[PDB]
Amino acid sequence: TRLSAPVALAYREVSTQPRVSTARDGITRSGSELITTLKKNTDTEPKYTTAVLNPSEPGTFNQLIKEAAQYEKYRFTSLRFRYSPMSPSTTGGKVALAFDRDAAKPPPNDLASLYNIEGCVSSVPWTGFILTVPTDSTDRFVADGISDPKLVDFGKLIMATYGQGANDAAQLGEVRVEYTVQLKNRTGSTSDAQIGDFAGVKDGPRLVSWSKTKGTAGWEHDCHFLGTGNFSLTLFYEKAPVSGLENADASDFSVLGEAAAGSVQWAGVKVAERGQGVKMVTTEEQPKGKWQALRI
Amino acid sequence: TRLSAPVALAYREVSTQPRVSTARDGITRSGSELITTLKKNTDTEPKYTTAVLNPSEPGTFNQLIKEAAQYEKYRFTSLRFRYSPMSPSTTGGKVALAFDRDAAKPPPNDLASLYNIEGCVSSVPWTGFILTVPTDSTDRFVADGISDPKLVDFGKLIMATYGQGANDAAQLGEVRVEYTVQLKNRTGSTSDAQIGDFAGVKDGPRLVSWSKTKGTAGWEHDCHFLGTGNFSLTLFYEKAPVSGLENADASDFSVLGEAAAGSVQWAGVKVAERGQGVKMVTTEEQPKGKWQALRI
Amino acid sequence: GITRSGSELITTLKKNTDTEPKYTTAVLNPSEPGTFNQLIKEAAQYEKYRFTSLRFRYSPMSPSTTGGKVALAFDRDAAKPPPNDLASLYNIEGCVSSVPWTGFILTVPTDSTDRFVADGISDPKLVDFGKLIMATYGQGANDAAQLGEVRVEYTVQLKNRTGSTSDAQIGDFAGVKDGPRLVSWSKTKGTAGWEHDCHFLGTGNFSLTLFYEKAPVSGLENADASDFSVLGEAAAGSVQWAGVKVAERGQGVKMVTTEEQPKGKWQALRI
Amino acid sequence: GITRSGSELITTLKKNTDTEPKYTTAVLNPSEPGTFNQLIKEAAQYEKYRFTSLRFRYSPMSPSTTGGKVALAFDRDAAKPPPNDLASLYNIEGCV
Structure with missing residues (x-):
């Protein structure tokens, strides 16, 4: 019968x-967090935005990171994502949420493959929906450095948008986690400051992800x-590098220092949006040095 | 009647x-921590070692700091210090524990005044004792910057040693907190990295305490x-300062940087023991600059 | 499959006369020579294990008038470096401490997962079950040289089976090494020349x-080993048997060649 | 106490043109390098043993056009010299 459509x-x-x-082995924390707000995509093909599901991940969790710094292992006994619409009912396109159990595989390349992922739900941008992911009973180590994500990460969320018309809302909605983690073991509190060199070493929460790219001036390292x-x-x-720190695509970048042998910079x-960062240029592949990211 | 004395x-x-x-307003965390180990003092007058009682104090609490970073107010419903002896029964002198409700007053100057403090207990170094401090029902803000300790700090523990002979144990014992804090309110997780300039500004956990002292070469700032x-x-x-960072009395000090206008150092x-630090020298009282302490 | 319960001596703690605590670690893997001296031989013939029951004991060796303390904690992540301050060590789950002259125990709860016997190049979080941290601090100059002995009383379940691993560790100067991790070489240029020392x-x-x-600049020479005796003759195209x-981990010998990565071959064995 | 099971390789037999047997023995003790190549390492840690079960499998390797015979027998005395004739060899209990 008739089914109305609100504005x-x-x-x-x-x-x-x-x-x-x-509990006997640790603590059981339950709560809810906000990952990000989806943006309009005026193109048929999807545009993806990922979020690794693992405590001590600054991108995903903001408060559970502090509580998980005191523990060594975790187990998501129940997690579930929700979508809150903030656009009118005259917006086209669609929003898709899928959970890839492999945290290293890049997001798919075409819309057909996106729907083959098990549990991939989707709906119009102007209505809310919930994606609940089945969990397991395997303990995994909280992220502490460079390691295979297959061994530590529980999974990776994928958010896609596409099909929106030209004159539509700038932002369509926002995702929200609803987890219940089982932190186990215990250890001396660990600092939250990623530190490592350019040789592929990383020690701490995953706040940064460097990436080389050969260029005419030299190898460019991008600090995403x-x-x-x-x-x-x-x-x-x-x-001495070719150039110091420069704003690649971030916002409000300021640096206090100089570029030279033995010098130290501080940017x-x-x-404003996940993925932005800075860049530097050097003539030596795999340069020698140190870096330290922090949430200040 | 007879009372034996073990070795x-x-x-x-x-x-x-x-x-x-x-709970309804927040969480109630209970646990135990280790403050420090008392050392021998071969002198009649006491030698003091303080520890400010306030969550988010790195000197006192090591694990409660992380859990208190997510909250705004606290209330110690029950706290109690304990002393564990690790010296033979042939060691002289005494060990005193007192709780000063004013966190800014310096420790006393003579043994007579130390015993006037309410609740000041003491015993021989080779036996254990417990100092339990009465609490109140007043909420106080968790330390976040430069503020009057009368308004935020609940108190300050004072540990004194004296009277030990020349040939006695190098270390007499170790104190241990046993608290039950009532964290209230809630806020976005705050970073744990003190940051501030030399003008008297401090923002973050109290990891550092600068102190000027006029000298022949210039004003020396000591980073305790x-x-x-x-x-x-x-x-x-x-x-450009007179000199960069130098090891004052700390252990294993290394610095990567240079001293000059616009330069940045990284030490x-x-x-090994609370109170040690580094130093720097400048010709300008209240120099212009920034510093950032961290637990790495 | 095979179940092998037993008890072995890891090491003997020593006096810590300096102010800072000293942490000595022993990774818990059946193939580790640092912690196991008899289970290593049987684990060499298996490529999987599971610690059904694990537990550590401290046996006093010092007089009753010894100050200081000794601590024993188990850290599930074998990759993490040893703690930096006493508070963090004492915050580890199930950390037991006591005065040197009295013994205590530390029971380690165990899970039901299988791990590959260590090879030496894999992720420690994937193969190792954890590690043990032994701390000694607060000892004066009048105390005994040795405080006590740490022992592991275990019950392992080695599974599968494969060709026995070589009982001796052959290697090549500045190159490939195979067999149990008995020694590790290091190089540092000096006045005479490149100095190669094994630990x-x-x-x-x-x-x-x-x-x-x-021909090398000099033959095998004691660096800090307890005992030493060379029966060879250093020269071009010769062999030196020593x-x-x-007594303590890290002791070893040294040599000088003046040429980095000299061509040669070495063999190590625990006789 | 400990119980272990394995499957070692003693040796590979060789051709013998002569019609008279050519014997090659292998004493059966856990700490015998000639027989066991892997059990010796674990037997060095113990000073007593008891063979709960024991078998000897001969796995052919020669073509189908080779004559002669191969015999396996177990002598419960480890010092007796091997027999000097075929009949004595076949009189041993269980010889196959």
């Missing part, structure tokens, strides 16, 4: 109270920031 | 399991570290 | 044989 739907969001408790917020980045060059980068 | 007493310490729980562990200290000089200081 | 990860009587293609006794 818009309003969802009432109130920040709930996390439920912490103590996985999270979104205020960050600081201290660099130390053993050899207070600021990120 | 030594052995206390069995096992790291218990913190008891976390959720309240805690004990591995720290990093990034400095930025707007004007991985390491501390 | 013995295990403790006991060893037997190091070497072969020089070109026996080194190690």
Whole structure:
């Protein structure tokens, strides 16, 4: 029979109270977080935005990271993502949420493959839906450095948007986690400051992801920031580079220092959307030095 | 009647399991920590070692700091210090524990005044004792920057040793907190990295305490570290100083950088006992610059 | 499959006369020579294990008038470096400490997962079950030289089976090494020339044989080993056979060639 | 105490043109290099043993056009010299 279509739907969001408790082996923390807000995509093919599901991941969790710094292993007993629409009912396109159990595989390349992923749900941008992912009973180590994501990561969320018309809402919605993690073991509190050199060494929460790319001037190292917020980045060059730190695509980038042998720079980068970062240029592949990312 | 004296007493310490729980306004965390180990003092007058009682204090608490970073107010419903002897029964002198409700007053100057403090307990170094401090029902803000300690700090513990003979144990014992804090409110997770200039500004956990002192070469700023562990200290000089960073009395001090206008240094200081630090010299009182302490 | 319960001596803690605590680690893997001296032989013939029951004991050796303390903690992540301050060590789950002159125990809960016997190049988080941290601090100058002994009483379940791993570790100067990780070489240029010194990860009587293609600057020389005796003759195209006794991990011998990565061959064995 | 099971390789037999047998023995003790190549390492840690089960499988390797015979027998006395004639060899219990 008849089924009406409202001009818009309003969802009432109130920040709930996390439920912490103590068990025999550790603690059981429950809560909800916000990952990101999906943007309009005026193209048929999807545009993806990922978020690795693992405690101590700044990109995904903001409060569970601190509570997971005191523990060594975790187990997501129940997690579930939700979508809150904030666009009118006259917006086209679609929004898709899928959970890839492999945290290293890049997102698919065509819409047909995206729908083959098990549990991939989707709906119009102007209505809400929930994707609940089955869990398992395997303990995994909380991220602490460079390691195979198959061994530590529980999975990776994938958010896609496509089909929106030219004159549509700038932003379509926002995802929201609803987890219940089982932190186990215990250890001395660990600092939250990724530190490592350019040789592929990383020690700490995954705040940065460097990537080389050969260029005419030299090898460009791009410091992509996985999270979104205020960050600081201290660099130390053993050899004089071609250029210091430059704003690649981030916002409000400022650096206090000089580029030269033995010099140290200090850039207070600021990120508005996950993936933005800075860059540097050197003539030596795999340069010698150190860097330290921080959430300041 | 007869009362025997053993050659030594052995206390069995096992790291218990913190008891976390959720209440209407926040969480109630219980646990135990280690502050420091008292050292021998072959002098009649006392030698003091303080520890400010306030969550988010790196010197006192090591695990509660992370859990208190997510909250805004606290209330110690029950705290109690304990002393574990690790010296033979042939060691002289005494050990005193007192709780000063004013966190800014310096420790007393003579043994007579130390015993006037309410609740000041003491015993021989080779036996254990417990100092339990009455609490109140007043909420206080978790330390976040430069503020009057009368308004935020709950108190300050004072540990004194004296009277030990020349040929006695190098270390007499170790104190241990047993608290039950009531964290309230909630806020976005705050980073744990003190940052501030030399004008008296400090934003973050109290890891450092600068102190000027006029000298022949210039004003010396001493970077005393309240805690004990591995720290990093990034400095930025707007004007060329007399000298860069030098090891004052700490252990394993290394610096990567240069001293000059606009330059930045990066010192991985390491501390074996609370109070050790580094130093720098400048010709300008209240120099212009920035510093950032971290637990790396 | 095979179930093998037993008890073995990891090491003997020593006086820590300096202010800072000293942490000595022993990774818990059946193929590790640092922690196992008898289970290594049987684990060499298997490529999977599971610790059904694990537990550590401390046996006092010092007089009753010894100050300081000794701590024993188990850290599930074998990759993490040893703690930096006492508070972090004491915050580890199930950390037991006591005065040196009295013994205690530390029971380690165990899970039901199988792990590959260590090879030496894989991720520690994937093959190792954890590690043990032994701390000693607060000892004066009048205390005994040795505080106690740490022992592991285990019950392992080695599974599968394969060709026995070589009981001796052959290697090549600045190159490939195969067999159990008995020694590890290091190089540092000096006045005479490039100096190559080996460090013995295990403790006991060893037997190091070497072969020089070109005449070296100097032959095998004791660095910090307890005992030492060379029966060879350093020269071009010759071999030097030596026996080194190690009391503490890290002790070893040294040599000088003045040419980086000299062509030769060496062999190590725990006699 | 410990119980172990394995399958070792003693040796490979060789041709013998002469019609008279040519014997090659192998004493059966856990700490015998001639017989066991892997059990010796674990037997060095113990000073007693008891063979709960024991078998000897002969796995052919020669073509189908080779004559002669191959015999396996177990002598419970480890010092007796091998027999000097075929009939004595076949009188041993269980010889196949």
